[PDB]
DNA sequence: ATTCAGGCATGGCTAGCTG
DNA sequence: CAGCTAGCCATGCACATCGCCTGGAAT
RNA sequence: UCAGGCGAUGUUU
């Protein structure tokens, strides 16, 4: 490789081969004069040590050095070590079609989608954009196409919305330990310049928001898209393969939330009354005539599938807390009621 | 009393402990060391004198001629710091050497035939140190780190346990000199005393023992003691000192005076020894059993035979007894041995010895040192006489000598640089004695054995290496002398010296690139103590216990400042009050203690001396008279800590600050935080980016004034006086009367430093801080620097903040920030990048810098000139063209802005290699710089003359005034007139000659500066012209950055809400930042909450004053109110009183207060809760420190009132746009057709091994295939892939990878045959 | 106060001649540990249920609304241990030798700290960090070996 | 340095304390650590840190007590032979000046001030391995020698 | 303008000493 | 002639990133 | 465009 200046970056194999060839030519010249044999012995010894150097510099005695102080690299090192070919260019290769950025939170997302920044996208899916362009017939060749996508005119952004709509992507974090370490998502375009990522996964990634970095990846072929959707989309991982406990455990604020939302004092506003339904419960709490927690008798109705896989209802007058009734409007059809009639710490919500 | 320029903004102060030793000059290490390096000094003693007087004189091979030294002298640089930073040369200096050559006659006394003295021969160049303690090599600003390594001397170590798994510890001893080879001693489980020279194979130490020309008899005499037997006609009876029966059990009955005293086979008390010594008898008979175990000392020979009768170091037997008896030998020498007292280790070693004499021993050592070499008498002689006894390859230090005698209980502390037989013998004695049981090992980590070098010392060593190489050369050449015709320039060639010193200051494990982006960052990078470097250990191949703190780091090394990660403990920062002892240990101050008073006399102490005394902790309640209010007190004695008595202590702490570093003393309320977070806090604070408007942090620690004033970015004055002229460029100070020198009296001029470049791409700027007509006192601020203000150190800004979760957006640590911040531009930062285009001259054609370019429209071309370089001020964007460069074939190679940055073009530089035509633009810039320099120096002369004429006038008024005759003739020449016969006339003549000298000086400097600028300076060979262009981006703030506290809570700003939605308060104000409460109990740093409260109090006082001032009142109200605000507490130091502030300064004081009443807090003596409460009560906020709020969206009330207050926050330089990155299809590496790595090189990410494991874990396969085949390796693969993508058909075609093909080739390179096979 | 009185009694007994060196050592360390536990229980009772109010009758206690106790009992962050190191004394501190030091840290992060105490806590933290590093190394190596055999 | 001699009552008490630590104390801190681990950060967290510290401290205690219980020589000897002062005996001693003391002599693990709190390795006991009622006995304190006299003895 | 001087843990192996 | 056996070498030591710097002496 | 040095940011008792 040529350097900046009238010099050249010295390699190692070059120096080694050159040494061997010098020594060989000298010996060849020596076998014409029939010099005394001690000389040719010293010669052969030099040559043997040199070929030794070329094949493995560092296995005989003191290894030959190079420019400054260090053993120049030989073929044995080309293959060995943490920096030979195996562990550096055949088990993990750098890869095109990617990018990286900083993460933030953005809690307005459903957990099967994640943010992404416009500029990153328009740099990623350049081929797709080219294609849809000359399909809709806006530029003859690829030239005007690339000129348009650099100038960043109007229609490109609409085109990009049309091509991202259902095209999953992969997110990666650096110390990948267990196979959660790579999950999938669908993009939703954002402004700014930093990936937005759902909260309920920052436990599986083991990734706080203190300035970490995440990498993107874009599948190209069609089998690949279907792989990423049917196997690695985030919805299909709610259990660590280590052990059957859930991994979508709500983490650290949401828990304080639910906690303060369900508890009981002994005496607050609106204590000692009766409510026809969780609906008017929430209505009270919004209007501001009843405290957020005060024990109350209310009516609730619950479902149970005790039949041959069939749902059956039953209703009654439970004794509970107003906030707890408000929480009730989210439980789906099939659970019992006692699951949400206590403190709701962390273990509780987990089970 | 107070300085006049402190009265501007007097900083309220809590704290109790009266301080007695003000903070010293924070840059002692660097400057004192280097000054010591280079300065004229007699009698050698650590300068260039040292190196020279060591190497010279240089004598021929008795060639009757010899070279010697006289005196050295420097000159003065051709350039100076500013020009140098611009151009790229080193800030260097000439070096001249006066040498003397002399010649003697052949066959005569030392009669000088002839001598000559070359006129100060040139040699080499050495860099100087800028007044701020930084070096300047190549347009950059490097720094050298003080190094911490093991002291020269002797050492005794255990290496307990692990070895040999036998439970029996070992003991080894090492000698490490300052320049030479090593030397060791150690035992083995078989109890034998072995030696090794320089980590090589092992030997029995007797080899070198007798290599010192000793006989076995002498060796035994040295080590062991004597026991005698003589011919008393039967068993050849004995005499014995009863002391030799110390705690023993006799194997034979002890009889004397016909009286038995102890039973045969019992232990013996000391009363027995007492009574028998009182008896005073030694003649005793012995049995034969007690005999055989002994060993002969000397060798007996007989009259007739004289043959091998007895060999020294041999045991006994009755036959030997009979043999020596029948030969008639009176005396019998033996060896007093034991098991718990005297192990006969030397005798065992001797029995293991294979050697016989000095000759064979030298042979053996010569053979083990260099394998495969012919043993030879002179060879071994001259070898072993050159590893422990000659100046050539071995030398300790004075320091080495001091330690080496100290650890041997010697008497004096000055000797030779070499070893001695006596010394080695004594070392081995000490080791044996340690094995016996008395004495103790000495651990390494104790700072009495580490040592701190510095720039001066290391420079001296390298320069010495240079001198010895040049003397090799000089000796070589001088071996071929001539007839008097050569002169001392052929006898010298400095190129090796230059090579050595350049190599050191340029490329070495210590000289490194200065982190210059924040004043604090500088001043804590210069004071860095590193354990790495040539002469020290390594990063991960180094020990463990050195990475640990030791109970003697106290006050000499920070506990809590070090980068985490791959190298902790190795990069200890240096303490605050630490100094450098004469020999080079770490010494700290203390206060002397008399009988019952804490006297006010300081006293410096070293490491080892500390161990013997007893030392009193700082925060101890004294009472005004040195009396400790208790009679017991917490103190430390020897790595201990325990309550002691009253009349025992002898030294007390100086202040309380002395257990931290400047890097971590700015942390208010430090003591309430853990260790971990204090650490991360100091480190983050070090990375603060400057701002565009600094604002005096509220909760400070009083250690700001020094940290700023002395870190020489702000411009300190030198002679107090009256400000005469102000302007963003320069400041012009008139001097007072009596702080003046008689000649060249004049006035001082300060050239500030306008917008220019850092080394981390930040904007180093300066701003005036005074106005016309304003007195200034010596040693005071005049120019604020980057992130400074009014002198004090400021890093970020102070903002109103409230702790409460708020709709998720602060989920984990995500700070939230309201637009009220991004409007006022109170985090806007300024960055500057620097782009370079070059003009090579390659065969097939030289390059071009024209404007005309093929295949580009008028769009890009319009911004360019008619010459090819962008105007000074265009607002270029990403992709545009700054310089037009083309390569003939003609191809475009113009210079374009890297994609992403906006900005503006603030400045352009042009360099041209001499011998080439110039363009139009370079000529124009030349004329510009000429004109400016001329005007500048003309103004210099004009204002200086103005001051001098003013002084003349002021003088003529005294002693011969002519008020009317003075202004008759103009300012032209007021010396036309005369003065009486007085020294005032002498003074007039002084002034006149100074005026004429200034005339001539202006002339010469003008001409010289013109000549400097005119020429085309040198360059790297093979180049024609370089163009450099600057840019100035203005990055504001946007979701993704990293703002931080100081206590150590990080965060990534995440949304910018509109003004409305921030939770407001009942009085109406919004709030600006909303952190996450759950972060506080987790990271146990309770501090930031107290910081918040105290800040709330501050701003309370502030707003109160602002109201009182806006409703303009009589000043007396302000007087009283500020008075109260300043008293407010228990006994303190401050004791200000505004009864003496001239009734006008008060107003200006209120002016600078209306933003807050800055409170200070020393580190371990800070404000307590009660005083915080009472300050708040002086305000009007509620005592609880919590307020109710009102959420903006719902417009209703939160519950359970929350916390608000001002929490000074910082910004780090991990901005988002230096991390966002993406690649689709770019370059490709050359060897293995793979995509490149990094960002600057427009490459892509890395798909790691563990990730391949993950994808295998899922069933996904096609993803992995095209992840490491189509997107990386197969050339045909990705071409096909691209062509198919452009038309909808999503489908790959794998093919074979290529890196694998390379693997095949490189294995085939060897004798191997690897192949593919049949299909 | 009572703890100090006890160590004074033990010191008197030592210089009176009824114990040995390590004997005094262990005696002292045990009684400090016991005091530590008493303090912990004291603070926990003084917080968890401290709220006592009227009911429209006279009084009845209930679980509290102290913010820190909520942030702990929920399971969000921190627990009895951390609230200890914020309220009660922060126990004992080993030294690099491993020999546990013979004077507890009678302070706590809310009140201040005199120098020595903070210094010793530094000992602890630094050793912790170094072990983090080396342990990481070995863990990675183990994972790699396992995946290359299965 | 040590003596495996221990009394059977303290032996039982110590075994019971061992069982207590290993059954009803370990698992709770265990659950706490298993809980805290599920949090994200580990270097930015302290709850895991200090709970782990608790585990280390309890483990050290159980290790020590285990080795002890391995190496405990028990002598549950009766008052069968009496007349001297050798072990496991109540002892009154008085000064020639008025200072009095009552104590029982036991092994190393039984010293916590409650009932019988003196270890044999102490110089006091070392000067009393066998004596007769009404006799002088001296010891060597760090402040010099001392003296007392026996009053009475009752084994059990 | 060509040219010749601070690690640890482990395993594997080889002289070298007792029956 | 065999069973250790202590002493001497080979080989091993997480992942990801960013910025700056420097690449033969003599003839 | 390759190799080394240095420093720094993350996960990490
Ligand atoms: Mg993190």
TrEMBL record, chain D:
One of its GO terms (molecular function) is RNA polymerase binding. The keyword Plastid does not apply. Residues 81-155 form the Transcription elongation factor GreA/GreB C-terminal domain. Residues 6-74 form the Transcription elongation factor GreA/GreB N-terminal domain. One of its GO terms (biological process) is regulation of DNA-templated transcription elongation. Keywords: DNA-binding, Elongation factor, Protein biosynthesis, Transcription, Transcription regulation. Pfam families: GreA_GreB (PF01272), GreA_GreB_N (PF03449). InterPro entries: GreA/GreB_C_sf, TF_GreA/GreB_CS, Tscrpt_elong_fac_GreA/B, Tscrpt_elong_fac_GreA/B_C, Tscrpt_elong_fac_GreA/B_fam, Tscrpt_elong_fac_GreA/B_N, Tscrpt_elong_fac_GreA/B_N_sf, Tscrpt_elong_fac_GreB. It comes from the Bacteria. Necessary for efficient RNA polymerase transcription elongation past template-encoded arresting sites. The arresting sites in DNA have the property of trapping a certain fraction of elongating RNA polymerases that pass through, resulting in locked ternary complexes. Cleavage of the nascent transcript by cleavage factors such as GreA or GreB allows the resumption of elongation from the new 3'terminus. GreB releases sequences of up to 9 nucleotides in length. Belongs to the GreA/GreB family. GreB subfamily. This is Transcription elongation factor GreB. It comes from Escherichia coli.
